[model samples]
Target: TTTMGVKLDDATRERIKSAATRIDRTPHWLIKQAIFSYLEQLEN
Candidate 1:
């Protein structure tokens, strides 16, 4: 698996965490799902 990393600003990280909270999922799950969804779209 490819690993991606970066230093996000506080505001960005907070936004993602808030979104994930609304759906009752961790930020890691939200981000991983997002990446897979994006890749699937491109290939289809």
Candidate 2:
């Protein structure tokens, strides 16, 4: 398990939240998915 934190401007945060909601997902879940995907690529 890993815990990550990020700081973004309000505009970027809103964009991420909007995308997550549009896909019926939460921002946290989307971020976790992105992080894990990148890690997998790095490991290869």
Candidate 3:
């Protein structure tokens, strides 16, 4: 229950990787943080 999977198209996948590199973070962390923040907002 601690893991999940997501699917992305090649263009979006490349953009996420590039953005992550620019921010010096892993794409996984970036996506995870996005989900966390979004959920926080939704709950509030």
Candidate 4:
């Protein structure tokens, strides 16, 4: 297992939180999913 730390401005943070709540998911899950998806996109 690994730990990651990221910093985002208040607006981005709130936007992420709101999206998570809207989709019934946690911010952690949303962030990780987005990160992995982006990584795969760039790796192609």
Q: Point to the candidate with the largest TM-score.
A: 4
Worst 10 residues of 2 by lDDT: 1-10
Q: What is the lDDT of residue 27 in candidate 1?
A: 95
Give the runs in model 3 whose Cα sits over 4 Å from its true position: none
- Candidate 1, pairs of clashing residues: none
- Per-model lDDT: 0.94, 0.90, 0.94, 0.96
Which scores better on lDDT, 1 or 4? 4
Task: Work out the TM-score per prediction.
Answer: 0.80, 0.72, 0.82, 0.84
For model 2, residues 7-39, the per-residue Cα lDDT tens digits are 989999999999999999999988888789999
Each candidate: how many clashes? 0, 0, 0, 0
Cα lDDT of model 4 overall?
A: 0.96
Model 4, span 1-44: residue lDDT tens: 99878989999999999999999999999999999999999999
Rank by TM-score (best first): 4, 3, 1, 2
Candidate 4, residue 43: how far the Cα is off, in Å:
1.4
List the candidate 2 regions with Cα displacement exceeding 4 Å: 1-3
lDDT of 3 by residue, 1-44 (tens): 58787888999999999999999999999999989999999999
Model 2 superposed RMSD (Cα):
1.9
Which of 2 and 4 is the better model by TM-score?
A: 4
